[PDB]
């Protein structure tokens, strides 16, 4: 739609569309 | 045009075509660079 919905902590809500989209050598 | 600007440079800015006495290297540089690069 444009500017998406945002919560109080300035975070854009995620919809369902967003949801679906040691080693050592041994020579012998 | 390139007649009033030359007159303007003489009268307002004191231009004159003073002689430039060039060395052979400088004389060659101006005569050869008018033809091209190599």
């Amino acid at each position: 739609r444009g500017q998406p919905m945002r919560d109080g902590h300035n975070k854009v809500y995620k919809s369902f569309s967003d949801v679906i989209e040691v080693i050592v050598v041994g020579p012998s | 045009t390139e007649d009033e600007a030359r007159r303007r440079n003489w009268i307002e800015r004191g231009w004159a075509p003073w002689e430039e006495i060039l060395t052979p290297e400088a004389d060659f540089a101006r005569k050869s660079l008018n033809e091209g690069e190599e």
Binding site: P27 | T23, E25, A26, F28, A29, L33
Partner: protein
């Protein structure tokens, strides 16, 4: 086994060619065992010879001093004549 007798030198491209011919002739089970034996031989000989690296080993060709000094001389002469107005800045840049 009818292996050819190499008698000059075995470098990286020579050993790669030999392995490919061994694979095509003997198969991969034979060549896999051959690789293990050749690998062991290479490690053992590299240790016994003990190649190293020192300051003296970093050899510069004899003529570098002559060549660098000649390039310095030509650059130095061109810089003078650039200051005299005999060559322009692009010519100095290219040279």
């Amino acid at each position: 086994a009818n292996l050819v007798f190499h008698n000059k030198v075995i470098d990286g491209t020579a050993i790669k060619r030999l392995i490919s011919r061994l694979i095509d002739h003997f198969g991969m089970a034979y060549t896999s065992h051959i690789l293990d034996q050749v690998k062991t031989l290479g490690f053992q000989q590299a240790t016994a010879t003990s190649i190293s690296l020192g300051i003296d080993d970093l050899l510069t060709i004899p003529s570098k001093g002559w060549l660098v000094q000649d390039a310095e001389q030509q650059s130095l002469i061109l810089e003078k004549h650039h200051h005299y107005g005999n060559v322009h800045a692009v010519e100095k840049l290219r040279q």
